[PDB]
A paper describes a structure:
Five members of the [name] family of Cl− channels and Cl−/H+ exchangers, [name], [name]-4, [name]-5, [name]-6 and [name]-7, have critical roles in endosomes and lysosomes, catalyzing the exchange of two Cl− ions for one H+ ion2,10–12. We recently found that the [name], [name]-4 and [name]-5 clade of endosomal [name] transporters requires the accessory β-subunit [name], which we refer to as T9A or its closely related homolog TMEM9B (T9B) for proper activity in cells and animals. To resolve the mechanism by which T9A and T9B regulate the activity of [name], [name]-4 and [name]-5, we determined structures of [name] alone and in complex with T9A, finding that T9A occludes the Cl− ion pathway and that inhibition requires the endolysosomal signaling lipid phosphatidylinositol 3,5-bisphosphate ([name](3,5)P2). Each [name] protomer comprises a cytosolic N-terminal domain (NTD), a transmembrane domain (TMD) and a cytosolic domain (CD).
Analysis of cryo-EM images of [name] in complex with T9A revealed four classes that can be distinguished by the densities corresponding to T9A. We also identified two asymmetric classes in which the densities corresponding to the T9A protomers were incompletely resolved, with the LD and/or CD of T9A being partially or completely disordered. The weak density for these domains suggests that they are more dynamic than the TMD. In addition to [name]/T9A, we observed two classes of the complex in which one or both T9A CDs are disordered. The TMDs are resolved in these classes, indicating that the disordered CDs are present but not bound to [name], which is consistent with immunoprecipitation analysis that demonstrated that the LD and the TMD but not the CD are required for the interaction between [name] and T9A29. The disengagement of the T9A CD exposes the cytosolic entrance to the Cl− ion pathway, indicating that these correspond to disinhibited states. We, therefore, propose that the T9A CD blocks access to the Cl− ion pathway through a ball-and-chain-like mechanism. Densities corresponding to [name](3,5)P2 are also resolved in the asymmetric [name]/T9A reconstructions.
Author numbering:
A (entry chain A): 78 to 369, 374 to 479, 495 to 737, 745 to 809
B (entry chain C): 78 to 369, 374 to 479, 495 to 737, 745 to 807
C (entry chain B): 23 to 114, 156 to 183
D (entry chain D): 83 to 114
Write the structure that this text describes.
Amino acid sequence: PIPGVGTYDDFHTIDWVREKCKDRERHRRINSKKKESAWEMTKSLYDAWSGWLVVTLTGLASGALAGLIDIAADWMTDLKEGICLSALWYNHEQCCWGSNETTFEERDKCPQWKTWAELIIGQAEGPGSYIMNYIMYIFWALSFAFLAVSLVKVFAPYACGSGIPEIKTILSGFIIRGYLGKWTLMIKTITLVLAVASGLSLGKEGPLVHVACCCGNIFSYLFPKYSTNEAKKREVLSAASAAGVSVAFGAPIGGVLFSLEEVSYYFPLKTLWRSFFAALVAAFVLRSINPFLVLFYVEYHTPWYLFELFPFILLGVFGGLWGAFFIRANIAWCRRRKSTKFGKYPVLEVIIVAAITAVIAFPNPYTRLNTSELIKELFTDCGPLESSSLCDYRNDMNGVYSAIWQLCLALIFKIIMTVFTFGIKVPSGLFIPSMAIGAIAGRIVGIAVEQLAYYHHDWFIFKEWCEVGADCITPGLYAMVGAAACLGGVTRMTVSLVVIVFELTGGLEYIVPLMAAVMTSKWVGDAFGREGIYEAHIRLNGYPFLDAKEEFTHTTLAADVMRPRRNDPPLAVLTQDNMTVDDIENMINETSYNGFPVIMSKESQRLVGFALRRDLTIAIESARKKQEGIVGSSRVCFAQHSPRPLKLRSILDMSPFTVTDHTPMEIVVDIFRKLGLRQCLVTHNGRLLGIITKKDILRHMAQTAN
Amino acid sequence: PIPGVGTYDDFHTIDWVREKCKDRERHRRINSKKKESAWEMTKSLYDAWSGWLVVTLTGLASGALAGLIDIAADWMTDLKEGICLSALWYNHEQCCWGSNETTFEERDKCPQWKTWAELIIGQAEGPGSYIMNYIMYIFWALSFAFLAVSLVKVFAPYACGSGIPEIKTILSGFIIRGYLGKWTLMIKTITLVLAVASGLSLGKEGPLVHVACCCGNIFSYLFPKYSTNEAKKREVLSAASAAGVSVAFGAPIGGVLFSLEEVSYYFPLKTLWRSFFAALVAAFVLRSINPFLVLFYVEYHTPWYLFELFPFILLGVFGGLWGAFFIRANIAWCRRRKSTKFGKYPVLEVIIVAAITAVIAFPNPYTRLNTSELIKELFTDCGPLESSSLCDYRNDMNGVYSAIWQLCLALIFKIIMTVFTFGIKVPSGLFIPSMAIGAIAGRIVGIAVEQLAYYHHDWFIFKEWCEVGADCITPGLYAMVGAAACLGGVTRMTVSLVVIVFELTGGLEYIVPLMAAVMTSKWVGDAFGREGIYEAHIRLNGYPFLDAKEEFTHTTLAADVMRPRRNDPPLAVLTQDNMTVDDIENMINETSYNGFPVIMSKESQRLVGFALRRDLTIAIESARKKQEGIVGSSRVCFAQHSPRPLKLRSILDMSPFTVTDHTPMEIVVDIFRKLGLRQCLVTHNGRLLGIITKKDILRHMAQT
Amino acid sequence: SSEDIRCKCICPPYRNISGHIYNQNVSQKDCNCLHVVEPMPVPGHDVEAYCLLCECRYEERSTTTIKVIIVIYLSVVGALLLYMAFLMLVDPRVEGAQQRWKLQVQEQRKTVFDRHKMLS
Amino acid sequence: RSTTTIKVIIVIYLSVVGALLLYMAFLMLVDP
Ligand SMILES: CC(C)CCC[C@@H](C)[C@H]1CC[C@H]2[C@@H]3CC=C4C[C@@H](O)CC[C@]4(C)[C@H]3CC[C@]12C
Ligand SMILES: CC(C)CCC[C@@H](C)[C@H]1CC[C@H]2[C@@H]3CC=C4C[C@@H](O)CC[C@]4(C)[C@H]3CC[C@]12C
Ligand SMILES: CC(C)CCC[C@@H](C)[C@H]1CC[C@H]2[C@@H]3CC=C4C[C@@H](O)CC[C@]4(C)[C@H]3CC[C@]12C
Ligand SMILES: CC(C)CCC[C@@H](C)[C@H]1CC[C@H]2[C@@H]3CC=C4C[C@@H](O)CC[C@]4(C)[C@H]3CC[C@]12C
Ligand SMILES: [Cl-]
Ligand SMILES: [Cl-]
Ligand SMILES: [Cl-]
Ligand SMILES: [Cl-]
């Protein structure tokens, strides 16, 4: 065919049927040429192994980048508190690694590490030392945020945000050129570390999915099969997203479950094993570099009891409520950023938010602590060896009020910040903030339950389930359940979320409470709204995304959504023969239609096929260059084989999809979703009457929802 | 509409589109009636909770039945060895559980338990005692097998077999009335316990899925939404299959992965959470009943090393090989059963197989021991506390050859027996036999590798990976990997299998070796054939199952598969008006077409709709009963509103799927697979020209 | 590398003596309670009780991995910032690709910064 | 150990098996 045929413009959905057919034709050619020569056999073998090789490369790159990002983010976050003069490449934990001056009270206390007050003021303690530490913390946070936003602006503006919404849209068939490019990969990798160091209420776990998808796209470019075909590249991107989730949470099974559940609009069977393999490879790499097995390992000696389900369900409810609230708040805030002028100053916005978050973060310990470190600490179970402040009250009696007040202040702070932080134009994620909020809430709830059990053991439930004077209640389990509930409420993810949380925990005993809390949070959120944060952001950005949840009214008919309608003039049509090249070029220029139907005759209106505008113009230009005398006067014949007429039957889909006008539009939406149809030609009495496009379907869905 | 309209005959596929439309119409009706009264609101709330309630009931029933079956099977299997006089209701382990006469050499040696020789011969040891134990073991195996096959034949013929292939066909739209009925459920449970007791090379883990599916169907009958609509019932059946796998292996996540990967033809997103929840519920019930949280818990102190991947890969290959062989052997044997006269005597075949199995199993310890128990023993790591014969050689030097010879004999016996034991007319599962074969092979390979490491530690790989004089090798890990490889090769399950093994053994650290072995076994099996055991059995049975792998020839076009073709007469069409009831009934009787197209005129051949033959006859009879004077002379008008003509437009499909003749057949198979259509009407120039059906596509694919 | 490996024993408070942590660079076989702490506060008869209450671990790290990751990340960030300064000040087939990317990044920056609403 | 669980499972399984065999015998002989 003509070079460039079968390609799509930027921001254009792909026709899955046509892409599949192109893949089948390429397979025909490659398989046929195998017997021609041994080199053809080697090429065919490489094509057969192209999928395995691409998933392996994607997993390796995802693991390497995830490990680098994690280590760099940890070091940069620890830079704010102070510096290690002996080893500038060591964070606070690594600087105090070999120190023998450590004490039981302070594990990270060593003369090697020097706080900024010690560097400048020279005093580790004192009002001036605290003032200087505060000022330097704010300064470092602002510097990191400004660097991240500037790098996003100058090089990769698409690098901002989690990217899960745009990945979901892309896997549905949408095309966003440059989203998965080299520049976006590099800039996002750097700015993720920068933003995480800045201390903003965001996480790097979610954006790792987009990073992995970028790696997968770059690797798909190497293999011809996955480069020519958009659907094949999207399968590779689903595998890449699974690998990204795996590296983010160390959960390969959870990664595959998330990829199937959320991002992958179409999930063939072979994608399942490919995604699992890629996730395993990436996790193995991360374990090879990042350690220096379970990131959030928990040791709750007492098993979860049935009555504990009641508090857990409450956490679930909370996980839903906040979730819904956030989906109502952030979107609105984001919407304002699109309508008001405060979105016209993105660097100023990020700098301001970093200033406020650092200012409100330094005073409190939990808020100042890194979000991932805070989640880990909240997950840890209290023990005699532990010196955590959270358990101080348990040591005192067995200040609880002081710890609960600090946790509540941290919860309020994080909840307020996360709304503004998401939508800010640096690589940000919702997994870590939501997990931190839910963990704080669960720790508060678990502390309350433990206090109730210890103070009141006469209650029959407490006495029967827990021995008198026994610490059956484990705050870490409650924190885990709260984190799972909040994440399920905000994301509306049920199975992938539960499996990811279990893998990150490393314990299968807590599957039932986690599922119960996630189900309760999802149900509460659905009561307050059936759209998740990712779906809500997709709708806010107005991307062409079609979902199974959306449906049309029974009164809607294919005639109603037909493009020509009444006010619109008759849809552009192309006569099979007796038409000049100039006519086709003028029609292409005049109309923005993705494609034009080709009919046997203008009066007959008997459809022959569908000619895409891109394919038509590409073929016309290539024929003009190839063959002389094509000044536009020569006619074009779409029928099967001096004027030297141009032939455009090759670029014509000889088998266009067709539905009848009295067909309910519900069936049309089902066909579009199942077959991934770009357009469908509504014909009456065997003659063309109109066209329904996926864009038309989305527009009428938006009108109904609006 | 007319009562009975939209129903499907036995052994007939459903059209997912009509079922979805019916479900949405019912949803609209319920939502509209909600405001009418408070009781309507309560009914709608119950309808909303119908899915959760039905999956909960399915999970509870699956867990209870799985626990019951497991305990009864254990007790019955221990029945063959002997009886506990002090407790006629404990098995061998339970009878000696509290005995103070237990010895280190024999853990299950207690006076309360008495072997059949003690009951009859009176001497625990001696040639006569051994002979009497042998004959009593054979007799008990024969009795159990005969009773199982008799119960299968007399009451529930569908109880025979694992049922996973038939569940695949059902979840693809096929209908087998009675497969998921109460009779099948009960007979399947009883005969599963009996067959496992008999000692045949079969397992209850796979058939537990079908038990769960039967429970799910029975519960679906309770809730109107899922009973009325076939697709909704199939979603419940997918959840039931997930719960069944969960109870079978205590692997909820693995159960959902199996449901998505293998049995569920269409898997909606909501069904994902429903299946996982049902699996967790069933696992909770099983944990509450069967124990008295990992069935095959393993403790491998030494982590797997990179070089060990090479033996694991080898195991993979072996699995694949065996896999292929079985899919080439069993099917053939099964085909012989369908072609020859030994299939006319299923009871005799079952009895003979049980006799041979018991006779060859008693002499050897591994084969005599229950297959699940043998797998568990193989998975256990050798240690000083362990007194297993497999590790005796390790206790000696650190008879290896004798233990390896016994393991090889057990492997050969199991491989031969599974070929003749799968497909017989009793509930049989391939999971346990495949796992046992792979575990024996992996244990042999691991013992060999341990011997190589100990004898030759000078090798740079061994010295670097393992300290000199250290038991880095873990035979249990190799057995686990071999079992996973064999199961993957025979079933061609990749992710669900790996997660199931991980949850069955609770070992996440060994995920990578299992993945590598399963991938290798699947790839060799594909080299020998892309179809697994279940797909091969579906093809052998002749069920109408369509898979994504199947595709048509590239010169094929819609016209080629069109029903009328050339030799066949023009496909029957019904005139919209001026057509009699008698003539429609005569057309229904004349042809066995699933449905006839309805055209506005014979000459024009302009398709108006598609009226199902079953729906047409049901409507005609119902109208005859309802309205007098319909003796067949009255005309039938399919067009929109003395003769009092019958109106069949309601039962007519106003918008049937249509595809142009020039359309390649492969586009048509993609359409059919995606939308699950029963038939599509090929029309040329806007006029009906032919009809393609799911059966036409399946027949043409089979011919190719 | 001594800094790469150590062994640490942390002991919670026992009777009179409060909890204490002792660290030393020793091998795994040498890594144990009686070796890491020398001498100990508790008496001889209670020494075993204190050790049992105390928990000991042998820890190892890969300082080279952290060093290389930090160094390469810093080098990439510095090169990116130098290129940013080049674009901000100096700029006012590889060259063809770079200018094409300049146009593409201008387009993406207009979509993502100026409007925030990219629909097509 | 949960002796009562094995108790009930074994007893009810035996009862159901006996009932099924009795029904089979009746169908074989009594039903004719
Ligand atoms: C083109 C892309 C996919 C290539 C990416 C290759 C990456 C994954 C490679 C390059 C260098 C590699 C590392 C080199 C050295 C070691 C030390 C060894 O004791 C553990 C593995 C480890 C830490 C490797 C892990 C994988 C690694 C990071
Ligand atoms: C209609 C169907 C779904 C109902 C099935 C109900 C089943 C699942 C019920 C009936 C009796 C129940 C058992 C009754 C008693 C006990 C003892 C308790 O210490 C643990 C739970 C356990 C072991 C229950 C498990 C669930 C159980 C087996
Ligand atoms: C097909 C299955 C369900 C039938 C199971 C029936 C079993 C349990 C029955 C059948 C024959 C029975 C035995 C027959 C005779 C005796 C002698 C008596 O002094 C002690 C009990 C003992 C040893 C019985 C134990 C139970 C027994 C083994
Ligand atoms: C945006 C990110 C990547 C930049 C990171 C650069 C950091 C690590 C740099 C910037 C300024 C540097 C400090 C500047 C001055 C001194 C005084 C000297 O006697 C010891 C080192 C010390 C204390 C430096 C340590 C490293 C330092 C904090
Ligand atoms: Cl995140
Ligand atoms: Cl995110
Ligand atoms: Cl089985
Ligand atoms: Cl099976």
